[PDB]
C-alpha cells in the first residue's frame, strides 16, 4: 500500500489487471471497500498533513483516482464505498478527513500550511515579486482542478444513481455550513475555504455546457423547480424574495413533478457561490482589520520588562505565539489575494454569473422568451408567482462576489462583453418594486452600480459606460428607476444616506457622459413634473442638516482625540463618528454638485412655489456656516481624508445662486428668508474665494455681487413695507403664525381662523386639528371672506397714510 502510493507509476500497469480481474467476477466492491479506506488511513495517520506542499504524494493520489475512475463498470457503483457519505451527526469540519472524497477536494493553495511555506519567509515582498509567487502555484492549482473535474464528471455520467448520490453528498455539506456567512463563524468548527472553493468551481464548470453563448440550452434548467418542495436544498430558514413563510407554505400546498439533474445542479452551484466563496470573500475582507488589532496588542506588551520568573516566561511565550499567529494571518491574506487575482478562474465565475442572470431574467419574463425576445417594461400581491417564492441567496451571492471582486485592477468584470446580462437583471430589480420588498439588498445592488460607474485614475469612462449606452433595455428606464429608488430609501438612520451617496455618483456620471440621459432628464421635469418634484424635495430635505451633522461629528472626533491627549470604546466611537462625518461631507458635496448641474440647465423646476421657500432657506443656512466661524475654526487634521473641503463646496454653492439668479421668484425668496440672510455673507465669500487663487473668476464675483445687491434692495423694500405696518389688532393675526392671514379659513373643529397655507402645511404632516386634536381634512375647511374683507379694509386704512 505504502509502496503503491510511493511508486504508482510502476504499479499503474501491474494493478490495472488486478482491478479488471474483479470486474468480470462481480467482486470489485470488496476490493474497493478494502483499498480506499486504507488510502484514507494512510493520508490521515502516516502523513500528518496531506496538503499541496507534498508534490510527490497528492500527484500519486490523483493518479490512483484517475486510474480507478476511467472504468465505466466501476464509476457506476463507486458510491457504495464504506464511508462515502458522511455521518448524520458528522461535524462540519470533519468532512475533509473522514470521507473518500474529502482530502482530495481539499487540495488548494489557500491552505494555512502552503501560505506559511510560500509567504512566511519574507513578509515585505515587492509587487513584482508577489505575482511570481502566485503564478508559481496557479498553474499547478489549475492542473489539480482540471483533474478533479475530470474525476467528478465521470462520476456524473457513470450511472443514474451516482448523480443522485453526489447531489445528496453536496446537499449534506451545504446544509452543515450555513454559519459561514456569520460575522464571527466558528472557523475551527466549519469547513475550510479550500475544501469548498474547489467544489464551487466544479459545479460552475459543470454549468459550462448548458450556459452557452447561444443561450439555447437555457430551457434545460427548470423554471418551476421551487413550486415543488426541494428534496436536497434545505429551504427551512431561507428568506424568500417577496413571500413570507405562510404564503410560501400555502403555495406549496396549492397546486400540490419529477426531479432532474440539470436544475438540481444549477441551484446548488448558487448555494455554493453564496455560502462558499461568498463567505470566503467576507473572511478575507476582515483580514485588513484583525492584523491592525493584533499589531497593537503585540506593540503594547513589548514595552513591559520581564523579571518575575513565573510571569516572564509567560510573557515571552505570549509574544511568540502571537508572532506565529501574525505570520499565519499575513501569509493567508497574501495567499487569498493571489487566489482571487487568478483571471483564468474568475472569468469563468463571472461568465456563470452572467448566464445565471440571463436565466433569472428569462424566469421574470411572462412569456419566458428573454434570451430571444426582449422583455417589455400591494407589491407582494402583484409580484410574479415564480419569482416571488425564490430564495434570497440567488441575488445576494453574485452581488457580494461582484462587489468584492471589483477592488482589483485585474478584475474579470473589466472588458467582458457578456457582462450586460447582469445589468439587465439589475435594472429590472431597479424598475419594479414588486419584485423585491427588501430595500437593503437593493442598496447593495445600487452600491454595486455605483462601483461599476466609477471613473478610473486616467479619468477614462468606467467599464460600464458602454453598457449604459449600448443596452436598449437599460437606457429606456434606468433614469426613472434610480429617481424612484432615491425617495424610497427613507424607510439613527445612519444608513439611509449611503444609498443616496451611491445614487448621487450614478446620477452625476449619467448626466455628464450620456446626452440621451441629458434629454431624458429635462423631459422628466417637463412632462413628469410631479414625479421629479418629489425627488427634488427629497434631495433638498436632507441637505439642510448634513452640514450640521458633519460639524457635530468633526467636533466629536476632536473632543475624543483631546480626551486621549490627557477606554477603547472611545476609539471605537471616534471611528464611528469619523465614518459618519465622511459620509455627511461626501453626500453634502454630491447633493450640491447635483443641484449645480441641474440648475445649470433647468432653473424652471427650482422656482416652483412649493420648493422655492425651502431652497432659499437651505442655501442661506448652508452659506452662513461655511463663511462663518463654525467651519473656519473647525481645523480638521488632513481634511482630504473626510472630503471636508468647504472651499471647494462654496464654488458649487455660489453657482447654484447664479444659475437661479435670472428668476425674480428666487431673488424674492432669498430676501424673504431673514433666518440666515446677510449682505456681509457674500462679501466674506468674495474674500474666501480670493484666498483660493484661480478658483473664482472676477466676473463670477461680479455676478455674485450684483445678485447680492439686488437681494439687498429687495429686502430693503420689504422692510419698508414692514415699517408702515406697526401696531396691529390681535384678531387679524394667525394664532399659529402670528402674522396677517392672506386667506383666512375657518376651522370646523375648533371654530378658529387660520391661513390656508398654514393649515395646508400642518395637514401635510398630520391630518389632525392643532387646537382640539380632532380629525381634520383639507376638504373640511370653510373660507372666511367676511374677515378677509376687514383685512383689506384695514390694509387700505394703513395705505391712507403711506
Amino acid at each position: 500500500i505504502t509502496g503503491i502510493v510511493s511508486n504508482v507509476n510502476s504499479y499503474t500497469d501491474f494493478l490495472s489487471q488486478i482491478i479488471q480481474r474483479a470486474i468480470l467476477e462481480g467482486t470489485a466492491l470488496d476490493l474497493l471497500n478494502a483499498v480506499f479506506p486504507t488510502l484514507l488511513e494512510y493520508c490521515n495517520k502516516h502523513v500528518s498533513h496531506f496538503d499541496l506542499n507534498e508534490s510527490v504524494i497528492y500527484n500519486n493520489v490523483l493518479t490512483i483516482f484517475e486510474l480507478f475512475v476511467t472504468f465505466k463498470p466501476i464509476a457506476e457503483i463507486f458510491t457504495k464505498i464504506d464511508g462515502f457519505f458522511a455521518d448524520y451527526s458528522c461535524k462540519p469540519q470533519d468532512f475533509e478527513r473522514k470521507t473518500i472524497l474529502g482530502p482530495i477536494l481539499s487540495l488548494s493553495p489557500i491552505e494555512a500550511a502552503v501560505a506559511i511555506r510560500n509567504y512566511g519567509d519574507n513578509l515585505l515582498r515587492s509587487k513584482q515579486q508577489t505575482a511570481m509567487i502566485h503564478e508559481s502555484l496557479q498553474a499547478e492549482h489549475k492542473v489539480v482542478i482540471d483533474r478533479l473535474f475530470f474525476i467528478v464528471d465521470k462520476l456524473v455520467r457513470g450511472s443514474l444513481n451516482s448523480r443522485t448520490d453526489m447531489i445528496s453528498y453536496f446537499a449534506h455539506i451545504a446544509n452543515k455550513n450555513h454559519l459561514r456567512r456569520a460575522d464571527h463563524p466558528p472557523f475551527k468548527e466549519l469547513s475550510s475555504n479550500g475544501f469548498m472553493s474547489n467544489i464551487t468551481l466544479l459545479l460552475v464548470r459543470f454549468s459550462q455546457p448548458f450556459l452557452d453563448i447561444s443561450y439555447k440550452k437555457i430551457d434545460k434548467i427548470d423554471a418551476n423547480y421551487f413550486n415543488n418542495p426541494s428534496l436536497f436544498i434545505d429551504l427551512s430558514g431561507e428568506t424568500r424574495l417577496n413571500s413570507d413563510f405562510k404564503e410560501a407554505d400555502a403555495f406549496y400546498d396549492k397546486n400540490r413533478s419529477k426531479p432532474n439533474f440539470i436544475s438540481d445542479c444549477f441551484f446548488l452551484t448558487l448555494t455554493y457561490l453564496h455560502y462558499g466563496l461568498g463567505g470566503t470573500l467576507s473572511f478575507e475582507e476582515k483580514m485588513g482589520s484583525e492584523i491592525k488589532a493584533l499589531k497593537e496588542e503585540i506593540e503594547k506588551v513589548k514595552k513591559i520588562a520581564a523579571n518575575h520568573d513565573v510571569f516572564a516566561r509567560f510573557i515571552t511565550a505570549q509574544l511568540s505565539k502571537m508572532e506565529k499567529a501574525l505570520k499565519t494571518t499575513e501569509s493567508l491574506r497574501f495567499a487569498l489575494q493571489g487566489f482571487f487575482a487568478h483571471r483564468s478562474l474568475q472569468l469563468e465565475v463571472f461568465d456563470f454569473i452572467c448566464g445565471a442572470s440571463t436565466f433569472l431574467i428569462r424566469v421574470v419574463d411572462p412569456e419566458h422568451e428573454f434570451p430571444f425576445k426582449q422583455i417589455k417594461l400591494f407589491l407582494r400581491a402583484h409580484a410574479p408567482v415564480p419569482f416571488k417564492y425564490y430564495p434570497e441567496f440567488v441575488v445576494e451571492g453574485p452581488v457580494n462576489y461582484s462587489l468584492y471582486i471589483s477592488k482589483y485592477q485585474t478584475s474579470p468584470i473589466f472588458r467582458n462583453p457578456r457582462l450586460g446580462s447582469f445589468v439587465e437583471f439589475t435594472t429590472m430589480v431597479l424598475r419594479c418594486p414588486e419584485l423585491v420588498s427588501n430595500p437593503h439588498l437593493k442598496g447593495k445592488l445600487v452600491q454595486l452600480l455605483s462601483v461599476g460607474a466609477m471613473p478610473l485614475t486616467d479619468n477614462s469612462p468606467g467599464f460600464m459606460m458602454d453598457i449604459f449606452e449600448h443596452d436598449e433595455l437599460v437606457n429606456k428606464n434606468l433614469l426613472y428607476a434610480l429617481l424612484d429608488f432615491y425617495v424610497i430609501v427613507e424607510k439613527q438612520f445612519y444608513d439611509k444616506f449611503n444609498s443616496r451617496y451611491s445614487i448621487s455618483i450614478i446620477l452625476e456620471e449619467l448626466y455628464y457622459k450620456i446626452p440621451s440621459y441629458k434629454n431624458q432628464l429635462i423631459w422628466q421635469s417637463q412632462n413628469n413634473a410631479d414625479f421629479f418634484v418629489r425627488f427634488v424635495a427629497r434631495m433638498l430635505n436632507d441637505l439642510t442638516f448634513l452640514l450640521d451633522e458633519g460639524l457635530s461629528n468633526l467636533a466629536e472626533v476632536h473632543n475624543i482625540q483631546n480626551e486621549l491627549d490627557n477606554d477603547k470604546e472611545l476609539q471605537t466611537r471616534l471611528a464611528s463618528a469619523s465614518r459618519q462625518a465622511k459620509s455627511s461631507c461626501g453626500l453634502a458635496d454630491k447633493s450640491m454638485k447635483l443641484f449645480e448641474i441641474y440648475s445649470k440647465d433647468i432653473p424652471a423646476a427650482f422656482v416652483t412655489p412649493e420648493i422655492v421657500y425651502r431652497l432659499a432657506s437651505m442655501l442661506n443656512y448652508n452659506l452662513e456656516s461655511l463663511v462663518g466661524p463654525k467651519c473656519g475654526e473647525l481645523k480638521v487634521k488632513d481634511p482630504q481624508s473626510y472630503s471636508f473641503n468647504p472651499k471647494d463646496l462654496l464654488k458649487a454653492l455660489t453657482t447654484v445662486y447664479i444659475n437661479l439668479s435670472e428668476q425674480s421668484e428666487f431673488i424674492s425668496a432669498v430676501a424673504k428668508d431673514e433666518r440666515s440672510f446677510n449682505r456681509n455673507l457674500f462679501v466674506r465669500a468674495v474674500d474666501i474665494l480670493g484666498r483660493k487663487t484661480g478658483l473664482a473668476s472676477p466676473e463670477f464675483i461680479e455676478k455674485l455681487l450684483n445678485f447680492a445687491n439686488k437681494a439687498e434692495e429687495q429686502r430693503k423694500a420689504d422692510e419698508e413695507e414692514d415699517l408702515e405696518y406697526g401696531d396691529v389688532p390681535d384678531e387679524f393675526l394667525d394664532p399659529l403664525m402670528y402674522t396677517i392671514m392672506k386667506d383666512p379659513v375657518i376651522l370646523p373643529a375648533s371654530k378658529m381662523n387660520i391661513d390656508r397655507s398654514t393649515i395646508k402645511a400642518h395637514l401635510l404632516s398630520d391630518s389632525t386639528d392643532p387646537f382640539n386634536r380632532m380629525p381634520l381634512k383639507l376638504e373640511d375647511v370653510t373660507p372666511n371672506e367676511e374677515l378677509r374683507q376687514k383685512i383689506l379694509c384695514f390694509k387700505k386704512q394703513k395705505k391712507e397714510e403711506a
Binding site: 457519505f85 415543488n228 428534496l231 413563510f245 405562510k246 413533478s257
Partner: protein, 76 residues
Amino acid sequence: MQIFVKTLTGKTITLEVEPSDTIENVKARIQDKEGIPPDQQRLIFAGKQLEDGRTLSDYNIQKESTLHLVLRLRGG
C-alpha cells in the same frame, strides 16, 4: 414490512408498516419515534405529495422503499 424514510438533514430511519395503514398512522408512528407532530410532517414518495386518508397500497409503495420527509417550514 419495513420502509426507509429519509430527512432533509440526512437521517435514515426504519419503520414497520402495513399496506392498508393510513398515512396519518405512519405520521403518528414517526411522532412516536421522534416527537414531530403529524401536521408539521410532510412525506414525499416518488416526488409526489401524499395524502393522509390514503394507504400505502393506493400509492403503490413497495417494501423497503425510500421516503422523503420534509418538515413544513415553521414560522417564527
